Design a protein around this ligand. Structure first.
Ligand code: 118
Ligand SMILES: [Mg+2]
Ligand SMILES: [Mg+2]
Ligand SMILES: [Zn+2]
Lengths: 1339, 251, 153, 236
């Protein structure tokens, strides 16, 4: 067992072995940016393939060009934490290398005229930190992936719903990454149509004329031909029999043999069987049979040149005779079979007004741009721009693969522009679907939806920046003299920087991070959204896209999703899910070879898995892979059934590959209703971290990975031995094997103390290790918020009883003991920030001072002489934190106030009080102050003091490492001059810096005795560089906005104890509000005197079917009951053998579980450390669909001498009597949610009104009123309460004279009103008169 | 209007009026230079389009957009719709003398009683307390009464107890589906911050204690107090108005 | 309107084409109308040219240094007093629309949170009236003729 | 799906049973949120059509009305006569099933005692008063409306009945989902809207399309009613 895991081992109840480990849970964000910023010698990725798609930019006339050669990214100015303190973006500069080549066309192409090479600066790129976030303007942000529809071709139909006849109508769409849309469709009368960008509709074959096709070739590539001979004036026809399937003869079919089928008899399969087995060649038929068929070719008279029949004309014996009277011995006709070979394109050709290429182009032009007649070049260019130019159209590298695979071609790669074969193949397959071959595809399959991530949505915006730069580089290459021009003078960098920073800062997918928990961030970085640019809209998404689809299995979690109007649109990735190179989700499976499950893993996509038979994870194995039985439950083709043990191709890797990470932390999920597991998974992400952290007694084994992979702890990089521990830093001394041969080998970890998070909670680390103990690579060295020894701890485990108590737990209410509020188990620290900004005015600058006019000198005690509060003060609402005065314009005085000034002689002064104060209700301790002043402004006493002390302990943190480098170096030279003798103790009595002038050895030793003084100054080569750089970064000014002179920021800290009104919940969807804190001696107690912590209602369980909260309560008792035994043996002072035996009996208990703990390989101190860690209960592990069973729970309850039924007898605390029946008592795990009642309470008597309508403002942050909405007026006029309503409308909201007259009536003790006309009615009358309408009030 | 920082903010009707003014001035210039008619016609077309976009923006063509690529709002979009004057400012408003908070259960109350926190009641009842303070001579002027209330002296809590005596209070929970969604109670001052509701009225409200919140309103005049006592008090509302059945059944 | 002036000032005897003379007046008219219209708050022409020159300098200093220059590094090259360089940098901002969506939704706008600042609080109205009454009562103690002079004074 | 879930929550489901049980859960959760909007929009249209109707007068003085009977279709009696006349006002002087059994000044608020009196006799049709036949213009009268269903007495003049009607209809809208005749009990058989003929096999046939067949109780109150298809041969 590992070092940090051998401290407290959690007992495992799971049965199935594990083949694949849980991957790194942040790979989706970290593998996607690394493709965008990396060097790729082959393109297709990121910056390289964005520079290879604009350049080279060639002159407008053809004279000169610009050529890209390479790029590189620089180093950032500040690191992440400096960026967060100062409030600036964390980015790196991009420096590209170009060359400018001028060349002439007088000489043929001569291009060695000149060459000018230079390196240009193109902007800043924000960088991703090592946890997957971006710092932008000082705040951490997350970019969320997007699930959207792939490019390519999609065949669909409306199912008998558009037309009244109940006929289905088919259509086909082509959709590019960038370009215009092209779609074909059918109509009731079976004519193909086409449209472009959902514009007005045109017949299909128009676009076949604009590709230079004639009616001959149009009918050639769509139809089949049958030939007729004239030989003896007798029409003969060469036939293959199968063409006559499903018909009925109107004539006699004669042949060499049998006279097969005649009047009334229709042709069955055995008839064409005769005709094929006898190989019937040309058959004579009546000449009335061919009359009505259409002709393929265009036939003209040879002598006179007059045409007899054109292509696609129906025949009659008139024209057949006319044809045979001219000498034509053959006729081609189009083979039609009215069930499979219908006439569609040939009857389509007969509604076109077009006859050749020019008329078709003119008609397309008339469609796209109505209102002007085109010319022979405008039409051709417009049609050549739509789908056939690489700079206005691009099917992405994935759109081409999807296009090729949806038409059964065999090539994967190709071009991004359309072709003639492509449009012809799309028409062909739409027609085949119309004739009952193949089927439509569905749009919610996870083979028709893909994921794009940060490193692709950033590249797609860098490219539009580059395009806007090229469109202005092209001009300067035309208009002027290219002799004295360098490439720096041609590239403006602001379009690119604007395009990048707008995406990273104001997009819809770039979001303010959720930072309550480790789990809150882990979940926010794995979310998948369907909204955003290029996705759906909330109001216009239907029912079918919000549902669960059979292809979600293993790729998307079916449980965790919001509950408002966003319910189906936002999803979460599963535990083992991955992504393809094209952006399609895939899942791992094990391969089954000859009835033997093998340990080899294959990732499969949603299209590939439908072809195989895949077994389940709940399947037993005969110790070599063989299935133990002969009917296995399996999935195939989207369904589930029983199968033999030889029809099986794959198997699942684990029982938890179907759930997300937030729902794999619920114990006994298999016993919960799904409507409640949804709520439990949602509410786990709102828990607040408490003062002390406490592991769960019943977990699922999934807490260690969520804690470590969130980057909220300090993990050791290299093994070693702890050399220094403090409350604020740790120093590790590395081993010799992991040691790098060139440096000192000392790791330093600096912990984070009392920092505020995005949600005003407290981030704080504290060390786990003690001084002098060994440490291996990957071990946890310090804990973050909500972590205990390296495991996620979101709440505290309470002692609960399920029973009613006097109506205090009536509807989801909770009743709490006073011992819970007096042990500080649910107390939380909140940190809040306030700011005071000093600006310029038209009358002169404001000043931050301590000479505040018209305030008593008691209220100025907590300020220092610079005008700012001290660190360590205790402030409450109303106190002054930063004193400030503003210059004031001269004021008028009322006559009465003038006489008052004349009598009492006092005069006012030129300045006004604008100080910063504590908001009401808040009471806190000041813990931090920061001052930012402008370059060119006098720094003040307090700013200089902050300067001094941060300089001081900024210097002190650097002199610590030179002692490892300098002093040891002396011990190196101590043994190289003494060579030739031993002068050790004589050498130990003189000072050390004098160790250069000792008894000198031979000249070899002497020249290296000067080499030592070379290295002894190499040390001062390296030191002062670093120190001066740090001092310069400390004492330098900053970049405050235009107009502001300085800024002061104060940080308060507040403690919040639990109280009636606070919301509380568990992991099973059970939630409720605290209703009462009641004394310790009113609580129900058991026969041993021990009272209970929390009392819950039993009426909540049956009608919600979250049974997992009962079983947990029974298991948490069995765990606690074991600790109480170990605890006793440590008070009773038993020897180590008794503890060894009892703990080994406790770890060996259960059915054939996969875990094996043998303590006989432990030392005695290790057993005692484990026992001291277990003396408050033994922790248990219960995976989601692999957990513990009631037999094992009861066996463990017996091991701790507890009742097997799980129910005990309780007494009433107020009367001492017994309750009639036994009660369920156990240990549950509860969580305090960030819905505190201090935030939510609000009230307003009067306040500020808005500008136009002059009604109260809204919100608690604005001290606003409450909306008396539209459907509350209905209730009030259903009661008949007319005066209540008239006062809600006039004098409380909106009447300007009445609302100030009412106040002075209320102060004088007269409850009466005088209502007038509201203000918004007058606003309405003005805005109607401004439309030209005369509206007025008649009297 | 200026914001904090020197930046300004403006309406869209300014953007739409400037275009009209300086396309009308140009036409008054061209009619004096005696230009060709092909140019005066183009001016008259542009003037027509500008006035149309000032009155109703997206009606006769493409919608004119602003420098952030959003269509400008017009004189007709300020009257009509879910966010026009009619439905947003005239048929429902924001009001003074009101608050809200989380609710919890008190099982010891009578049917005509609710529990109200002390701090909410001190804020909602301020002018009543000022007048009562300066009637007893405990304060000389209204501005000293303000500081007495702000310091929370001991006599303030004794004036508050006789101000709320026989003063009803309207409670309301959204969505208000029928008229039993607003009812009048008599308040009982408590410590703490959550409101306490009688267990028998949670069925007309459709309320429960998994986190719901409620709003509080104060009637000011004599007639509103009479109507809150006679018409809306919870002890007159035992029957349903849809069918004649009782509504207070135990759950 | 500029082409209609180039046509009025042309002289064919000088031998040049019409394009060469007309382009000057066309560009002049368009440039003069961009600087007079197209801003909500109008800036004079000399300030427009000062703004444009400072933009042109900061472009090349940004290309050359790799950073954005502080107003000191712009004052040293533009050769103007630094306070004027600080004064110019505030005049180049266009007012925000009051329909700007603020939140996740698009039903909350910037113009909803803008407060009226020219209203008097009702405590101040009550104080004014009480002081008027108190003064009227104290002015009744002394003589009528000796209070008429204070009322007039 | 073909194979059902053969397990319960006390025993625990499979991965597969849980997966196929999530479909219906999300379907219900999604229908709720997208039904609330339709319900609110319907309530708003009802309030807007009904908002200006108020009880204006005391008595208009008509003799018109509507005929209230129980509903017996679809099986047993689904709605008794008592639940449909309690509170209404009688339009004419109804008489217990003999002749001249007057209970009425012919304006009689049918409170509970009158309903008991009607049920100790057996009468199954009463002519009552209604608002769709009121003679008052710009309002209704108090007698055509009847009882205030939340106070228990005659409605007061000045009451806003339109907003109450709209709110009462709209409030429950969130719970809405969005070969031979046999005879049960013994009684007379009655036919209406009929025209008959004797058959060749000694049975009854009728040449009516729209006839009705009723079952008569001990006292003569109709307990069941069907209609026969045209051309059918009546067995008895
Ligand atoms: C042909 C080519 C350039 C200019 Sb010009 C200009 C002229 C009138 C009004 C505005 C601009 C110019 C500027 C200085 C000295 C001489 C000519 C000009 C300036 C910048 C960019 C492009 C053209 C004019 C005609
Ligand atoms: Mg929301
Ligand atoms: Mg609730
Ligand atoms: Zn009537």
């Amino acid at each position: 067992y590992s070092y940090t895991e051998k401290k407290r081992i959690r007992k495992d109840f799971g049965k199935r072995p594990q083949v694949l480990d849980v991957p790194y849970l942040l790979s989706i964000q970290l593998d996607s940016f690394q493709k965008f910023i990396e060097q790729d010698p082959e393109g297709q990725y990121g910056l390289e393939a964005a520079f290879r798609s604009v350049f080279p930019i060639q002159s407008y006339s053809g004279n000169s060009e610009l050529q890209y050669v390479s790029y590189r990214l620089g180093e950032p100015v500040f690191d992440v934490q400096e960026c967060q303190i100062r409030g600036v973006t964390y980015s790196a500069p991009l420096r590209v290398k170009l060359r400018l080549v001028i060349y002439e066309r007088e000489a043929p192409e001569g291009t060695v005229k000149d060459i000018k090479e230079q390196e240009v600066y193109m902007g800043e790129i924000p960088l991703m930190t090592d946890n997957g976030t971006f710092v932008i303007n000082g705040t951490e942000r997350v970019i969320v992936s997007q699930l959207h529809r792939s490019p390519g071709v999609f065949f669909d139909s409306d199912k008998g719903k558009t037309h009244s006849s109940g006929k289905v109508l088919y259509n086909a769409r082509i959709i590019p990454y960038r370009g215009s849309w092209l779609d074909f469709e059918f109509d009731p009368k079976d004519n193909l149509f086409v449209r472009i960008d959902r514009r007005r509709k045109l017949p299909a074959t128009i676009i076949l004329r604009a590709l230079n096709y004639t009616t001959e070739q149009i009918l050639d590539l769509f139809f089949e031909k049958v030939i007729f001979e004239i030989r003896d004036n007798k029409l003969q026809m060469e036939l293959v029999p199968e063409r006559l399937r499903g018909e009925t003869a109107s004539f006699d079919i004669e042949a060499n043999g049998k006279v097969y089928v005649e009047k009334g008899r229709r042709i069955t399969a055995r008839h064409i069987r005769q005709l094929e087995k006898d190989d019937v060649k040309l058959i004579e038929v009546p000449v009335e049979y061919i009359a009505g068929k259409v002709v393929a070719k265009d036939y003209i008279d040879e002598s006179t040149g007059e045409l007899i029949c054109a292509a696609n004309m129906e025949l009659s014996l008139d024209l057949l005779a006319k044809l045979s009277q001219s000498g034509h011995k053959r006729i081609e006709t189009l083979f039609t079979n009215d069930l499979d070979h219908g006439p569609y394109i040939s009857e389509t050709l007969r509604v076109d007004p077009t006859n050749d290429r020019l008329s078709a182009l003119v008609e397309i032009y008339r469609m796209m741009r109505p209102g002007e007649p085109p010319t022979r070049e405008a039409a051709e260019s417009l049609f050549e721009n739509l789908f056939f130019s690489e700079d206005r159209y691009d099917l992405s590298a994935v759109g081409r693969m999807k296009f090729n695979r949806s038409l059964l071609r065999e090539e994967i790669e190709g071009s991004g522009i359309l072709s003639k074969d492509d449009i012809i193949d799309v028409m062909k397959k739409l027609i085949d679907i119309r004739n009952g071959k193949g089927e439509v595809d569905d749009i919610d399959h996870l083979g028709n939806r893909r994921i794009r991530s940060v490193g692709e949505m950033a590249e797609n915006q860098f490219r539009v920046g580059l395009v806007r730069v090229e469109r202005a580089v092209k001009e300067r290459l035309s208009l002027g003299d290219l002799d004295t021009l360098m490439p720096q003078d041609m590239i403006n960098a602001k379009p690119i920087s604007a395009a990048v920073k707008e995406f990273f800062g104001s997009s819809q997918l770039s979001q303010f991070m959720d930072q309550n928990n480790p789990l809150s961030e882990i979940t926010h970085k794995r979310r998948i959204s369907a909204l955003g640019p290029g996705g759906l809209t909330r109001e216009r998404a239907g029912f079918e896209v919000r549902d669960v689809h059979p292809t979600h299995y293993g790729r998307v979690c079916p449980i965790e999703t919001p509950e408002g109007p966003n319910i189906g649109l936002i999803n979460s990735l599963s535990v083992y899910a991955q992504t393809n190179e094209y952006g399609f989700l895939e899942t791992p499976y094990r391969k089954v070879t000859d009835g033997v499950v093998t340990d080899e893993i294959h990732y499969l996509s949603a299209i590939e898995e439908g072809n195989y038979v895949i077994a389940q994870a709940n399947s037993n194995l005969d110790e070599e892979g063989h299935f133990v039985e002969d009917l296995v439950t399996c999935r195939s083709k989207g369904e589930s059934s029983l199968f033999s043990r030889d029809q099986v191709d794959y198997m699942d890797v684990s029982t938890q590959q179907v759930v997300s990470v937030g729902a794999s932390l619920i114990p006994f999920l298999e016993h919960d209703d799904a409507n409640r597991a949804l709520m439990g998974a949602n509410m786990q992400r709102q828990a607040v971290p408490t003062l002390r952290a406490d592991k769960p007694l019943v977990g699922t084994g999934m807490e260690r990975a969520v804690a470590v992979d969130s980057g909220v702890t300090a993990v050791a990089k290299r093994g070693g031995v702890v050399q220094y521990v403090d409350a604020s830093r740790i120093v590790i001394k590395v081993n010799e094997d992991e040691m790098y041969p060139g440096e000192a080998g000392i790791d330093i970890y600096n912990l984070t103390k009392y920092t505020r998070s995005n949600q005003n909670t407290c981030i704080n680390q504290m060390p786990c290790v003690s001084l002098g103990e060994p440490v291996e690579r990957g071990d946890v060295l310090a804990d973050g918020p909500s972590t205990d020894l390296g495991e996620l701890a979101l709440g505290q485990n309470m002692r609960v009883a399920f029973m009613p108590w006097n109506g205090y737990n009536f509807e989801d209410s909770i009743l709490v003991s006073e011992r819970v509020v007096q042990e500080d188990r649910f107390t939380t620290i909140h940190i809040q920030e306030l700011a005071c900004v000093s600006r310029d005015t038209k009358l002169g600058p404001e000043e931050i001072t301590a000479d505040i006019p018209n305030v008593g000198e008691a209220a100025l005690s907590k300020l220092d002489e610079s005008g700012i509060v001290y660190i360590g003060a205790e402030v409450t609402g109303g106190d002054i934190l930063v004193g400030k005065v503003t210059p004031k314009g001269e004021t008028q005085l009322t006559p009465e106030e003038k006489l008052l000034r004349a009598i009492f002689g006092e005069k006012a002064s030129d300045v006004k009080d604008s100080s910063l104060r504590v908001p009401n209700g808040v009471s806190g301790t000041v813990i931090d102050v920061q001052v930012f002043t402008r370059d060119g402004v006098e720094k003040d006493k307090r700013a200089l003091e902050i300067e001094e002390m941060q300089l001081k302990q900024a210097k002190k943190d650097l002199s610590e490492e030179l002692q490892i480098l300098e002093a040891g170096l002396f011990s190196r030279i101590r043994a190289v001059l003494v060579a030739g003798g031993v002068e050790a103790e004589k050498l130990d009595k003189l000072p050390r810096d004098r160790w250069l002038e000792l008894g000198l050895t031979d000249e070899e030793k002497q020249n290296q005795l000067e080499q030592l003084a070379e290295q002894y100054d190499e040390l001062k080569h390296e030191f002062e560089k670093k120190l001066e750089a740090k001092r310069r970064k400390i004492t330098q000014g900053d970049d405050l906005a235009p107009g502001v002179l300085k800024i002061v920021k104060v940080y308060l800290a507040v403690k919040r104890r639990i109280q009636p009104g606070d919301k509380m919940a568990g992991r099973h969807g059970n939630k409720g509000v605290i209703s009462k804190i009641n004394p310790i001696e009113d609580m129900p107690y058991d026969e041993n005197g021990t009272p209970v912590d929390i009392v819950l209602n039993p009426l909540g369980v049956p009608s919600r079917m979250n049974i997992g909260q009962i079983l947990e309560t029974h298991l948490g008792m069995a765990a606690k009951g074991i600790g109480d035994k170990i605890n006793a043996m440590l008070k009773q002072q038993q020897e180590v053998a008794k503890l060894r035996e009892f703990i080994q009996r406790a770890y060996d208990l259960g059915a054939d579980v996969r875990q094996k703990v043998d303590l006989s390989t432990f030392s005695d101190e290790e057993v005692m450390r484990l026992a001291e860690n277990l003396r408050k209960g033994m922790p248990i592990a219960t995976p989601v669909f692999d957990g513990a069973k009631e037999a094992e729970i009861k066996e463990l309850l017996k091991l701790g001498d507890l009742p097997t039924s799980g129910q005990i007898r309780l007494y009433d605390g107020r009367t001492g009597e017994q309750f009639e029946r036994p009660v369920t008592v156990g240990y549950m795990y509860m969580l305090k949610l960030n819905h505190l009642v201090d935030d939510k309470m609000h009230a307003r008597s009067t306040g500020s009104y808005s500008l136009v309508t002059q009604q109260p403002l809204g919100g608690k942050a604005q001290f606003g009123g409450q909306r008396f909405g539209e459907m509350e007026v209905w209730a009030l006029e259903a009661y008949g309460a007319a005066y209540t309503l008239q006062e809600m409308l006039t004098v409380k909201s909106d009447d300007v004279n009445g609302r100030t007259k009412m106040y002075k009536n209320i102060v004088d003790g007269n409850h009466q009103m005088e209502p007038g006309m509201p203000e918004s009615f007058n606003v309405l009358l003005k805005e109607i008169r401004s439309l030209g309408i005369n509206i007025e009030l008649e009297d | 209007v200026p914001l904090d920082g020197g930046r300004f903010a403006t309406s869209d009707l300014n953007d739409l009026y400037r275009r009209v003014i300086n396309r009308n001035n140009r036409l008054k210039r061209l009619l004096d230079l005696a230009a060709p008619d092909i140019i005066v016609r183009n001016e008259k077309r542009m003037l027509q389009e500008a006035v149309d976009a000032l009155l109703d923006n997206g009606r006769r063509g493409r919608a004119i957009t602003g420098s952030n690529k959003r269509p400008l709002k017009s004189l007709a979009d300020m009257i009509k719709g879910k966010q026009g004057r009619f439905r947003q400012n005239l048929l429902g408003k924001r009001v003074d003398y009101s608050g809200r908070s989380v609710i919890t259960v008190g099982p010891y109350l009578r049917l005509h009683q609710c529990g109200l926190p002390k701090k909410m009641a001190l804020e909602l009842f301020k002018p009543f307390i000022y007048g009562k303070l300066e009637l007893r001579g405990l304060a000389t002027t209204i501005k000293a009464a303000k500081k007495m209330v702000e310091r929370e002296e001991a006599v303030v809590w004794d004036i508050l107890d006789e101000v709320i005596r026989e003063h009803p209070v309207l409670l309301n929970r959204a969505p208000t589906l029928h008229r039993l969604g607003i009812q009048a109670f008599e308040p009982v001052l408590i410590e703490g911050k959550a409101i306490q509701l009688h267990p028998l009225v949670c069925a007309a409200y459709n309320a429960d204690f998994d986190g719901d919140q409620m709003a509080v309103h104060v009637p000011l005049t004599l007639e509103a107090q009479l109507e809150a006592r006679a018409l809306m008090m919870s002890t007159n509302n035992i029957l349903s108005p849809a069918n004649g059945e009782p509504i207070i059944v135990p759950s | 309107i500029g082409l209609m002036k180039a046509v009025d000032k042309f002289e064919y005897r000088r031998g040049y084409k019409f394009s060469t003379y007309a382009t000057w007046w066309i560009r002049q008219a368009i440039t003069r109308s961009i600087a007079d219209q197209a801003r909500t708050i109008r800036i004079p022409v000399h300030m427009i040219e000062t703004i444009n020159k400072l933009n042109r300098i900061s472009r090349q200093m940004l290309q050359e240094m790799g950073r954005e220059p502080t107003p000191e590094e712009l004052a040293e090259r533009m050769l103007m007093p630094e306070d004027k360089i600080r004064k110019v940098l505030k005049i180049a901002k266009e007012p925000i629309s009051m329909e700007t969506p603020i939140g996740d939704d698009e039903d909350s706008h910037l113009g909803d949170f803008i407060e009226d600042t020219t209203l008097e609080l009702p405590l101040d109205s009550a104080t004014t009236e009480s002081l008027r009454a108190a003064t009227h009562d104290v002015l009744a103690g002394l003589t009528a003729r000796e209070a008429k002079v204070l009322r007039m004074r | 799906i073909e194979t059902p879930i053969t397990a319960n929550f006390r025993e625990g489901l499979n991965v597969l049973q849980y997966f196929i049980s999530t479909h219906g859960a999300r379907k219900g959760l999604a229908d709720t949120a997208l039904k609330t909007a339709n319900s609110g929009y319907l309530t708003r249209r009802l309030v807007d059509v009904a908002q200006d109707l108020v009880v204006t007068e005391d008595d208009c003085g008509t003799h018109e009305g509507i005929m209230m009977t129980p509903v017996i279709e679809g099986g047993d009696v689904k709605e008794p006569l008592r639940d449909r006349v309690l509170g209404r006002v009688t339009a004419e002087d109804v008489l217990k099933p003999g002749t001249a059994d007057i209970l009425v000044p012919r304006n009689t608020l049918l409170h509970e005692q009158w309903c008991d009196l009607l049920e100790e006799n057996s009468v199954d049709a009463v002519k009552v008063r209604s608002v769709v036949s009121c003679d008052t213009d710009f309002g209704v009268c108090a007698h055509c409306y009847g009882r205030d269903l939340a106070r228990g007495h005659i409605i007061n003049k000045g009451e806003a009945i339109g907003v109450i009607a709209a709110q009462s209809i709209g409030e429950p809208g969130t719970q809405l989902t969005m070969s031979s005749i046999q005879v049960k009990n013994k009684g007379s058989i009655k036919l209406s809207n009929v025209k008959s003929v004797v058959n060749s096999s000694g049975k009854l046939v009728i040449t009516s399309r729209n006839t009705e067949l009723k079952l008569i109780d001990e006292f003569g109150r109709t307990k069941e009613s069907y209609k026969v298809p045209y051309g059918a041969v009546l067995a008895k």
